[PDB]
Scaffold this active site. Structure first.
Site, PDB file in Angstrom:
ATOM      1  N   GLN A  39       0.918  -1.127  -0.380  1.00 53.02           N
ATOM      2  CA  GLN A  39       0.050   0.000   0.050  1.00 53.02           C
ATOM      3  C   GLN A  39       0.303   1.134  -0.306  1.00 53.02           C
ATOM      4  OE1 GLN A  39      -3.110   0.816  -0.070  1.00 53.02           O
ATOM      5  NE2 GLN A  39      -3.205   3.196   0.716  1.00 53.02           N
ATOM      6  N   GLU A  67      -4.055  -6.302  -2.726  1.00 53.86           N
ATOM      7  CA  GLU A  67      -5.995  -5.372  -2.602  1.00 53.86           C
ATOM      8  C   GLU A  67      -5.580  -4.310  -3.314  1.00 53.86           C
ATOM      9  OE1 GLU A  67      -5.279  -2.734   0.986  1.00 53.86           O
ATOM     10  OE2 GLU A  67      -7.948  -3.462   1.151  1.00 53.86           O
ATOM     11  N   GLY A  96       1.798  -7.511   5.631  1.00 49.23           N
ATOM     12  CA  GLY A  96       2.441  -8.405   4.936  1.00 49.23           C
ATOM     13  C   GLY A  96       2.553  -8.678   2.965  1.00 49.23           C
ATOM     14  N   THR A  97       2.135  -7.711   2.439  1.00 55.25           N
ATOM     15  CA  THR A  97       2.105  -7.605   0.988  1.00 55.25           C
ATOM     16  C   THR A  97       3.767  -6.761   0.879  1.00 55.25           C
ATOM     17  OG1 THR A  97      -0.119  -7.481   0.138  1.00 55.25           O
ATOM     18  CG2 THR A  97       0.899  -6.270  -0.802  1.00 55.25           C
ATOM     19  N   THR A 126       0.503   2.281  12.972  1.00 61.24           N
ATOM     20  CA  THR A 126      -0.611   1.552  12.641  1.00 61.24           C
ATOM     21  C   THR A 126      -1.393   0.875  12.914  1.00 61.24           C
ATOM     22  OG1 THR A 126      -0.763   2.184  10.319  1.00 61.24           O
ATOM     23  CG2 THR A 126      -1.099   4.240  11.662  1.00 61.24           C
ATOM     24  N   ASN A 177       4.547  11.971   1.464  1.00 63.49           N
ATOM     25  CA  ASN A 177       5.144  11.177  -0.005  1.00 63.49           C
ATOM     26  C   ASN A 177       5.289  11.967  -0.728  1.00 63.49           C
ATOM     27  OD1 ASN A 177       4.220   8.591   1.660  1.00 63.49           O
ATOM     28  ND2 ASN A 177       2.534   8.434   0.199  1.00 63.49           N
ATOM     29  N   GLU A 237      27.783   3.270  -8.303  1.00 66.32           N
ATOM     30  CA  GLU A 237      28.945   4.397  -7.684  1.00 66.32           C
ATOM     31  C   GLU A 237      28.468   4.513  -5.866  1.00 66.32           C
ATOM     32  OE1 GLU A 237      29.671   8.168  -9.386  1.00 66.32           O
ATOM     33  OE2 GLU A 237      31.362   7.181 -10.935  1.00 66.32           O
TER      34      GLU A 237
HETATM   35  N1  LIG Z   1       4.666   7.556   4.275  1.00 65.24           N
HETATM   36  C1  LIG Z   1       3.651   6.658   4.226  1.00 65.24           C
HETATM   37  N2  LIG Z   1       3.687   5.275   4.495  1.00 65.24           N
HETATM   38  C2  LIG Z   1       2.781   4.722   4.838  1.00 65.24           C
HETATM   39  C3  LIG Z   1       1.564   4.888   3.059  1.00 65.24           C
HETATM   40  N3  LIG Z   1       0.721   3.803   3.270  1.00 65.24           N
HETATM   41  C4  LIG Z   1       1.390   2.778   4.413  1.00 65.24           C
HETATM   42  N4  LIG Z   1       2.163   3.525   5.194  1.00 65.24           N
HETATM   43  C5  LIG Z   1       2.725   2.230   5.839  1.00 65.24           C
HETATM   44  O1  LIG Z   1       2.644   1.165   5.716  1.00 65.24           O
HETATM   45  C6  LIG Z   1       1.991   0.705   6.741  1.00 65.24           C
HETATM   46  C7  LIG Z   1       1.047  -0.712   6.843  1.00 65.24           C
HETATM   47  O2  LIG Z   1       1.120  -1.396   6.140  1.00 65.24           O
HETATM   48  P1  LIG Z   1       1.233  -2.083   4.507  1.00 65.24           P
HETATM   49  O3  LIG Z   1       2.625  -2.119   3.734  1.00 65.24           O
HETATM   50  O4  LIG Z   1       1.095  -0.609   3.711  1.00 65.24           O
HETATM   51  O5  LIG Z   1      -0.074  -3.111   4.100  1.00 65.24           O
HETATM   52  P2  LIG Z   1      -0.665  -3.279   2.943  1.00 65.24           P
HETATM   53  O6  LIG Z   1       0.988  -2.542   1.165  1.00 65.24           O
HETATM   54  O7  LIG Z   1      -0.973  -2.477   2.636  1.00 65.24           O
HETATM   55  O8  LIG Z   1      -0.099  -4.966   2.940  1.00 65.24           O
HETATM   56  P3  LIG Z   1      -2.004  -6.015   3.383  1.00 65.24           P
HETATM   57  O9  LIG Z   1      -2.577  -5.474   4.395  1.00 65.24           O
HETATM   58  O10 LIG Z   1      -1.373  -7.214   3.842  1.00 65.24           O
HETATM   59  O11 LIG Z   1      -2.469  -5.221   2.020  1.00 65.24           O
HETATM   60  C8  LIG Z   1       1.930   2.033   7.609  1.00 65.24           C
HETATM   61  O12 LIG Z   1       2.003   1.402   8.835  1.00 65.24           O
HETATM   62  C9  LIG Z   1       2.100   2.805   7.036  1.00 65.24           C
HETATM   63  O13 LIG Z   1       2.860   3.468   7.913  1.00 65.24           O
HETATM   64  C10 LIG Z   1       1.680   6.154   2.455  1.00 65.24           C
HETATM   65  O14 LIG Z   1       0.955   6.088   1.316  1.00 65.24           O
HETATM   66  N5  LIG Z   1       2.622   6.516   3.276  1.00 65.24           N
HETATM   67  N1  LIG Z   2      40.242  19.427 -12.198  1.00 62.67           N
HETATM   68  C1  LIG Z   2      38.999  18.803 -12.000  1.00 62.67           C
HETATM   69  N2  LIG Z   2      38.576  17.707 -11.917  1.00 62.67           N
HETATM   70  C2  LIG Z   2      38.124  16.793 -11.026  1.00 62.67           C
HETATM   71  C3  LIG Z   2      36.860  17.077 -11.560  1.00 62.67           C
HETATM   72  N3  LIG Z   2      35.652  15.970 -12.025  1.00 62.67           N
HETATM   73  C4  LIG Z   2      36.129  15.315 -10.620  1.00 62.67           C
HETATM   74  N4  LIG Z   2      37.082  15.691 -10.373  1.00 62.67           N
HETATM   75  C5  LIG Z   2      38.424  14.895  -9.742  1.00 62.67           C
HETATM   76  O1  LIG Z   2      37.770  13.683  -9.643  1.00 62.67           O
HETATM   77  C6  LIG Z   2      38.184  13.464  -8.347  1.00 62.67           C
HETATM   78  C7  LIG Z   2      37.451  12.120  -8.257  1.00 62.67           C
HETATM   79  O2  LIG Z   2      37.484  11.226  -9.786  1.00 62.67           O
HETATM   80  P1  LIG Z   2      36.665  10.457 -10.586  1.00 62.67           P
HETATM   81  O3  LIG Z   2      36.159  11.547 -11.483  1.00 62.67           O
HETATM   82  O4  LIG Z   2      35.305   9.633  -9.897  1.00 62.67           O
HETATM   83  O5  LIG Z   2      37.283   9.791 -11.234  1.00 62.67           O
HETATM   84  P2  LIG Z   2      36.553   8.437 -12.310  1.00 62.67           P
HETATM   85  O6  LIG Z   2      36.335   7.900 -11.685  1.00 62.67           O
HETATM   86  O7  LIG Z   2      38.104   8.016 -13.170  1.00 62.67           O
HETATM   87  O8  LIG Z   2      35.586   9.126 -13.498  1.00 62.67           O
HETATM   88  C8  LIG Z   2      37.956  13.954  -7.217  1.00 62.67           C
HETATM   89  O9  LIG Z   2      39.076  14.051  -6.030  1.00 62.67           O
HETATM   90  C9  LIG Z   2      37.676  15.269  -8.282  1.00 62.67           C
HETATM   91  O10 LIG Z   2      38.593  16.573  -7.855  1.00 62.67           O
HETATM   92  C10 LIG Z   2      36.780  18.202 -12.601  1.00 62.67           C
HETATM   93  O11 LIG Z   2      35.957  19.141 -13.745  1.00 62.67           O
HETATM   94  N5  LIG Z   2      38.038  18.918 -12.768  1.00 62.67           N
HETATM   95 MG   LIG Z   3      -3.578  -3.712   1.442  1.00 57.08          MG
END
Ligand SMILES: Nc1nc2c(ncn2[C@@H]2O[C@H](COP(=O)(O)OP(=O)(O)OP(=O)(O)O)[C@@H](O)[C@H]2O)c(=O)[nH]1
Ligand SMILES: Nc1nc2c(ncn2[C@@H]2O[C@H](COP(=O)(O)OP(=O)(O)O)[C@@H](O)[C@H]2O)c(=O)[nH]1
Ligand SMILES: [Mg+2]
Ligand SMILES: Nc1nc2c(ncn2[C@@H]2O[C@H](COP(=O)(O)OP(=O)(O)OP(=O)(O)O)[C@@H](O)[C@H]2O)c(=O)[nH]1
Ligand SMILES: Nc1nc2c(ncn2[C@@H]2O[C@H](COP(=O)(O)OP(=O)(O)O)[C@@H](O)[C@H]2O)c(=O)[nH]1
Ligand SMILES: [Mg+2]
Ligand SMILES: [Mg+2]
Lengths: 427, 53, 430, 430, 427
Positions: free
Chosen positions: C11, C62, C135-136, C170, C219, C245
């Site tokens: 849900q 559901e 449980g879903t 809840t 959400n 990464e």
């Molecule tokens: N942040 C957020 N949490 C949600 C939302 N809807 C449900 N929840 C969370 O989900 C919990 C309830 O369990 P769920 O996994 O949603 O139950 P379900 O998905 O309907 O599973 P079944 O009842 O078996 O079908 C609650 O404690 C809420 O915290 C939502 O829209 N936003």
């Molecule tokens: N001078 C410069 N350094 C860079 C730039 N982008 C990333 N770096 C350096 O590259 C390092 C990270 O390495 P990374 O970019 O992930 O290497 P790669 O995995 O081979 O792409 C960091 O310490 C940065 O300071 C750039 O545009 N200019």
């Molecule tokens: Mg449900």
């Protein structure tokens, strides 16, 4: 007639190259439709370092954009200067590595590696002289770090005599973006030592700070942060694209900045960073580009360079400059503070001048620093990795794609080994 | 040959900043001269937060 | 193309789903008849010319909660075979939704999930909406989740379930029905996001100044949390967060996978004008226990992994400064072995406002989904409610007579007793 | 930036704050709805699209006076949560406002303080408004003041309270609530500024020549003192006097922090034309006992420190000539150990006149807030009224039954008695 | 090519120093915009003494503007000629000292002294060879008193051989703008003895007396008073910025006028002062300038010159003039009244001529005297210090910030010691 092939992975890698190829494009004077409308003859002299000539004047880069999600390329599809790329060079995934280093490397990694390396091999044979391979990716992520670091290991097997520039961003110490951040970083640096030849260390927290105290910006987007990174990547190969009084290519920095083969983690810097409020009042001369070069605030890494000694440093100057003012300013910084430099190496500073500045700037310079202060960054990531591994938290994912704890113990072993030799050289 | 673009297309993101419209770092990275109609903003203020005093 | 399938069971599932898909059709501009006057592929399935079909099913035994959907304003939206009814509900019984009437309808449930999975091109995960009280939602959700792990292995399954509140409930057999559900959602569901009705009653009471909240109002902002969770797929932003990464960042152990939920900006139409909504204000608002969507107090437990998904005009720097201010506070205490607790995601689409709704139009919003050791207070209290009622065999003959035996109460109690032991053992400082 | 939170406790704090914010909204040009048709940041928060909200809270246990603000002409100016109410009033009981009924609302009061403190980037002080005659102004005032000291340490707390007058008193248990407030306002407010209703009655009678003033006429010129002290933060001048400058120049000792108040150009509309308002003339006006806003004669005591604040067309030259003539006067006595006595401040903004107010438009104004030993007569008269009533235990069963104990009346009696000895000790010549 | 680093501290220092940068920019021909518009060739010959070259022909002051409140920085920049300063040089906090010496020197100055040393260094090694540092502040407040003298102690340790000229306004005898002057003044002067090398003592109510009976301006504001102070500041370095017939820089005034290292407090004066209706009756001759220059009513400190003997004096004459009239009226001012001069120092005066007069005046001179009568302004602060300290009034604010009462007695002893060395030279 030497060439650089560009390969990129993940969210971080693709967004940088969306701005990086943008910054390169208007330096060379080519439109987002690909046609050349530049007003200078010197732009078209060295285009082949970064672009394929095509029928009708189209220029397409050596760009191979790798990802496991269609999201990154979708930004590249619609972003500005995103139509210049080769559609065939967009290898893509569907599943996504999911911020997992194991998924991008071992299990799901193998289904795309045989396809992405085919795109690399087609471009490698098309150009004659390969100076090296340039990759830009992340480390804390999983898509560009997990798939990328396997790709670097494979391409060193096929091409072992070619250099490897990696521009890998690093987990920030102050803040964090992902949760498996130390897991994916320690597994990547464990592999980055063996395969890659030189590494530029970046992190967003220094890029965030450098946009505040040096640029006076309280709303930096990533696209603002990618621009400062893209200025550094243009500064490394400014010698290839343009002439100069003293020339230093990619391999010249390798013999300069790397004393021993495992000490290839550097820190970067870009000199003419002026806020718009204080733009008019500052002058542009070599002594005041140097004073912002060696500032600890200008470094785009976590490590404070005042903590650790500079083992070797490099400078990539751009502009019409006196050779003394390049020489004397970098000689004054060897005498004013010699406790911050290594005694058992004479003249720790490499300098080079290119006569073509970037668009609009009268002068510019890029700094690359092999400091031993980078061990502070590697200690903190190893500190976080041992904290989470001893509880085995977030490990049931990585063991799911086919990993056991043997390489996890090996990753901490090599991490503790490389930080041990930094502090041994600091004494 | 490309398919439809995914992940929508957000309008006006990231936003143009208040205290002059800044959508790029081209001014700082190209060293363009300040316009006379915009010089007064940086005359009055230090940071990019607008008109504190 | 990325896609995620949402199953609505019980849900609570449909009444969330009516609120969930109402928020979804306003984001893409789709009218209730199904006609839009390129990003709908995450949730909507394009058929014919100008018709979009939701990729969801309404499964409930559901029929009187599903028929109002079949005759309401969303008649032309849903596919009529997606709306699955039954002869009679599970009547908050776990044995009916799992053994007697559950098996007669779950065969038709898989018949349309396979139809939805075959129409999908690239699948990233599943969404399940249920309430363990009834449980879903409890039994049939347990049956469907157990079957889906057998049918679709290793795929993500997002658990949006609703638990009984401490002071508010809840139904009477809710302590019985919740405990038996925890045997299935432990070992099958990979990410479970607890929700609680009384906490959202309190959220609607003070933030939205509604004196008399209803199931529609609760959400509606449930729909806001899930839409914020998956806005990274539909729209573009600074830091995308994908489904897988999301799953590897917040699940450190395969059984410690229950996570909290917090949506920060709940403002009225009249308080929106007076609040200065910034990323520092909303981030501090999310970590407040008033904005917590489950009746648990996070100060007792330890935060263990958090993700912050931002929508709207969030620039990447001050959000990285907003996380730092959270870490400095002694009240928000993290576990010792995790020095990296935060995941961050930023999307550029401001949250839509439903016409006639209660939420106000905001330019910034953050949704936090966090794993904490304070969720043991949720399980231990429902454990005490079950142990008191079971001690004199109350409401057992309803459960036993519909196929069950007494031995399934001991196994479910022992399984839930391991969770309270696991939460204390993991969160202990070493 | 500079910011300040103004809390108003009790019924008397509301009509004071009702008369303050009507002058504050006029002085910055804020319309009653809340839209201006850079200097407003001290008291108003920029909210969204051209809206400002007052950095204030109106808390009172009795819901009558706060609901008058809710239905008044400023229903759109204030944030609805800031107008905090309660179920029932303390009802002239320091027992109820501090022990029984004050606890249920003081937690909600501190929560909104944390929201306002987080919004402001620099907080310079807390302006607390109360009257020690009522239970809410004294009991709830002391509970909020004690909590604000621990939560925000080393921050200035500027105390603006009204003591009972020697002759006019509107309540019987005013001696009881005054003594109990004195034990708490002594050790918590860093700086306290007295106001007395009798002297304001005499000010309106002699200066403004209105025969029958009400509380509305009282609080309007109270607010003219309020804006004049914070005049430096909002408008520029030659000699700025911040809130942190205000404390460290006027209090020689922590336990002596009760200070007087005065306002110079209190002239009606018809008499303003004839009077020649010079800096020399109004400075002589401010030092008269008739211009003193507290019913005591400064001639009995000795001035230990004075802080003159000027507004309008005042040059820095004649203010030094005016002070020189004040110092050479023999009826105005300064204490021997403080040769340098005056703190001078000159704001350039002339005072704003409210429509319907009795005050006239004047180019220059002086607000003199001075610590003195003549305030020792206040505490002796309230002690003698308390000693007579407590001698045979009148009006004690109300206080004892609602939480208080008998012994701590003597504790507040001894604390006030030590304040009597300290004022005599600091004025003794050495 | 000898340059001066200017420092401004507090509300008094920022307001005075803002007035200083119109009177020196107008005689150097710098418009309020920042460009150059002067019609004389001699102005640009020596402009590096105060100004730094910028792009586009712009000139910026070498002024670090320092306080603890953001209100005064906004007011200084909003005024005329306020847009010439760099936004980077506006160093400030947010709390505010609030006329508290302990809050400036110890508590809230510590978080800002690292920021102000960063920018005063950047203005030091940028220029060629430092003549010295110039600071202007107040001794009555707490922003320019506590955190101002903290900068002097730090910059004297870092640069020990450079000159230090301080313009400090002192509390009045008659009136009192604040309540805690003698606590602020006694603590500041005690730090000012060992650290600073020169101290031009100013008093606000000697300036009001100047503006009333001599200038006949009946409504003098702070714009008037700072204008008289700024003219003296331009008079000291007048021979630096412009050529002269007899040469005298800032260090020439040092060795001539400092007999003993603690005997270094001076008081100032500006001679060509006449009311606006009485300008026609004054003939600009050299003897006309000297009778006003030596007069008691013209001197800008509260000390009366007739009460004590003159240890050493200096006159810095400006304009086209005959150098023997620079000689005999400095001889005759010693022979006529030799009782007012020290016997054991013969020729107690020093003379200098700069041939470029200030704007609007063809004959001017700035007087720097070292009279033993300057003990009067120190002892009237000292008698107010002993009154308040013996009852310990207004002390809990100072001892609430980590300052014990021991250093109050230490500063009291030095004030009584400094009036002891002055007292034995008048006998
Ligand atoms: N942040 C957020 N949490 C949600 C939302 N809807 C449900 N929840 C969370 O989900 C919990 C309830 O369990 P769920 O996994 O949603 O139950 P379900 O998905 O309907 O599973 P079944 O009842 O078996 O079908 C609650 O404690 C809420 O915290 C939502 O829209 N936003
Ligand atoms: N001078 C410069 N350094 C860079 C730039 N982008 C990333 N770096 C350096 O590259 C390092 C990270 O390495 P990374 O970019 O992930 O290497 P790669 O995995 O081979 O792409 C960091 O310490 C940065 O300071 C750039 O545009 N200019
Ligand atoms: Mg449900
Ligand atoms: N200056 C001024 N004083 C007032 C005003 N209204 C009430 N008072 C003073 O307040 C004292 C009594 O306290 P009230 O403010 O009336 O009531 P309370 O402090 O809120 O206490 P409760 O009535 O129990 O809530 C009287 O002695 C008056 O002197 C007013 O409008 N202006
Ligand atoms: N000459 C001059 N003196 C000023 C000015 N403003 C303030 N003062 C003096 O400064 C003293 C107060 O010090 P204050 O301004 O608080 O110094 P701060 O604490 O460093 O800001 C007063 O005695 C004034 O005489 C001004 O514009 N010119
Ligand atoms: Mg070569
Ligand atoms: Mg009341």
């Amino acid at each position: 007639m030497r060439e650089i092939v560009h390969i990129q992975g993940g969210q971080c890698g693709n967004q940088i190259g969306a701005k990086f190829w943008e910054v390169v494009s208007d330096e060379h004077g080519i439109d987002p439709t690909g046609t050349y409308h530049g007003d200078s003859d010197l732009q078209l002299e060295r285009i082949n370092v970064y672009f394929n000539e095509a029928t009708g004047g189209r220029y397409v880069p050596r760009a191979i954009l790798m990802d496991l999600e269609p999201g990154t390329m979708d930004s590249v599809r619609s972003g500005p200067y995103g139509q210049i790329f080769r559609p065939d060079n967009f290898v893509f995934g569907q599943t996504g590595a999911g911020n997992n280093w194991a998924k991008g490397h071992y299990t799901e990694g193998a289904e795309l590696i045989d396809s992405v390396l085919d795109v690399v091999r087609k471009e490698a044979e098309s150009c004659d002289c390969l100076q090296g391979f340039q990759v830009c990716h992340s480390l804390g992520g999983g898509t560009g770090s997990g798939m990328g670091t396997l790709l670097i290991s494979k391409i060193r097997e096929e091409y072992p005599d070619r250099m490897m520039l990696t521009f890998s961003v690093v987990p920030s110490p102050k803040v964090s973006d992902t949760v498996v951040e130390p897991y994916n970083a320690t597994l990547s640096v464990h592999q980055l030592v063996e395969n890659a030849d030189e590494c530029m260390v970046l992190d967003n927290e220094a890029l965030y700070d450098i946009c505040f105290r040096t640029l006076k910006l309280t709303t930096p987007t990533f696209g603002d942060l990618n621009h400062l990174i893209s200025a550094v990547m243009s500064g490394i190969t400014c010698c290839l694209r343009f002439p100069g009084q003293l020339n230093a290519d990619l391999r010249k920095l390798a013999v300069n900045l790397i004393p021993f083969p495992r000490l290839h983690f550097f820190m970067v810097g870009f000199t003419p960073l002026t806020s718009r409020g204080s733009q008019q009042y500052r002058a542009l001369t070599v002594p005041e580009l140097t004073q912002q070069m060696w500032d600890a605030k200008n470094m785009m890494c976590a490590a404070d360079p005042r903590h650790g000694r500079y083992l070797t440093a490099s400078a990539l100057f751009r502009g019409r400059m006196s050779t003394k003012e390049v020489d004397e300013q970098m000689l004054n910084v060897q005498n004013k503070n010699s406790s911050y430099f290594v005694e058992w190496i004479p003249n720790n500073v490499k300098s080079s001048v290119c006569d073509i500045p970037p668009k609009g700037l009268k002068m510019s310079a890029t700094f690359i620093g092999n400091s031993t202060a980078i061990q502070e960054m590697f200690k903190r990531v190893s500190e976080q990795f041992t904290a989470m591994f001893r509880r085995k938290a977030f490990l049931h994912w990585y063991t799911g794609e086919g990993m056991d704890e043997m390489e996890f113990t090996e990753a901490e072993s090599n991490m503790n080994d490389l930080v041990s030799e930094y502090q041994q050289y600091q004494d | 040959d490309w398919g439809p673009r995914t992940k929508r297309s957000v309008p006006d993101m990231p936003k143009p900043n208040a205290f002059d419209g800044r959508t790029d770092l081209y001014a700082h990275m190209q060293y363009r001269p300040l316009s006379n109609g915009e010089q007064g903003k940086y005359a009055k203020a230090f940071d990019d937060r607008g008109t504190r005093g | 193309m990325r896609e995620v399938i949402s199953i609505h069971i019980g849900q609570a599932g449909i009444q969330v789903g009516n609120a969930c898909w109402e928020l979804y059709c306003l984001e893409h501009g789709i009218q209730p008849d199904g006609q839009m006057p390129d990003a709908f592929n995450t949730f909507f399935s394009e058929t014919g010319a100008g018709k979009h079909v939701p990729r969801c099913i309404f499964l409930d035994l559901e029929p009187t909660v599903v028929d109002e959907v079949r005759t309401g304003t969303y008649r032309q939206l849903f596919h009529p075979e997606q709306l699955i009814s039954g002869k009679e509900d599970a009547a908050n019984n776990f044995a009916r939704g799992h053994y007697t009437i559950g098996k007669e309808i779950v065969d038709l449930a898989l018949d349309r999930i396979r139809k939805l999975a075959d129409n999908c091109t690239g699948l990233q995960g599943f969404l399940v909406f249920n309430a363990v009280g009834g449980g879903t939602g409890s039994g049939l959700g347990s049956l469907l989740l157990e079957r889906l792990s057998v049918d679709y292995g290793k795929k993500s399954k997002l658990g949006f379930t609703v638990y009984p509140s401490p002071q508010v409930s809840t139904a009477v057999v809710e302590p019985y029905n919740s405990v038996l559900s925890t045997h299935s959602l432990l070992e099958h569901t990979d990410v479970a996001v607890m929700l609680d009705n009384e906490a959202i009653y309190d959220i609607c009471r003070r933030s939205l100044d509604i004196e008399r909240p209803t199931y529609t109002n609760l959400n509606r902002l449930i729909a806001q949390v899930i839409s914020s969770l998956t806005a990274s797929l539909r729209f573009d932003g600074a830091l995308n967060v994908d489904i897988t990464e999301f799953q590897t960042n917040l699940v450190p152990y395969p059984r410690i996978h229950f996570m909290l939920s917090s949506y920060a900006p709940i403002i009225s139409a009249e308080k929106a004008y007076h609040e200065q909504l910034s990323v520092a204000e909303i981030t501090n608002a999310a970590f407040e226990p008033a904005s917590m969507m489950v009746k648990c107090d996070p100060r007792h437990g330890k935060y263990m992994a958090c993700c912050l998904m931002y929508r709207g005009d969030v620039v990447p720097k001050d959000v990285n400064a907003s996380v730092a201010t959270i870490k400095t506070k002694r009240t928000i205490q993290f576990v010792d072995w995790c020095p990296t607790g935060f995941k961050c995601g930023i999307n550029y689409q401001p949250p839509t406002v439903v016409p006639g709704g209660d939420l106000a139009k905001v330019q910034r919003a953050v949704c936090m989904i966090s794993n904490s050791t304070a969720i043991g207070e949720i399980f231990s209290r429902l454990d005490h409610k079950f142990d008191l009622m079971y001690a004199k065999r109350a409401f057992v003959h309803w459960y036993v007579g519909e196929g069950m035996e007494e031995g399934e109460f001991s196994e479910a109690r022992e399984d839930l007793a391991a969770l309270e032991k696991d939460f204390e053992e993991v969160g202990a400082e070493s």
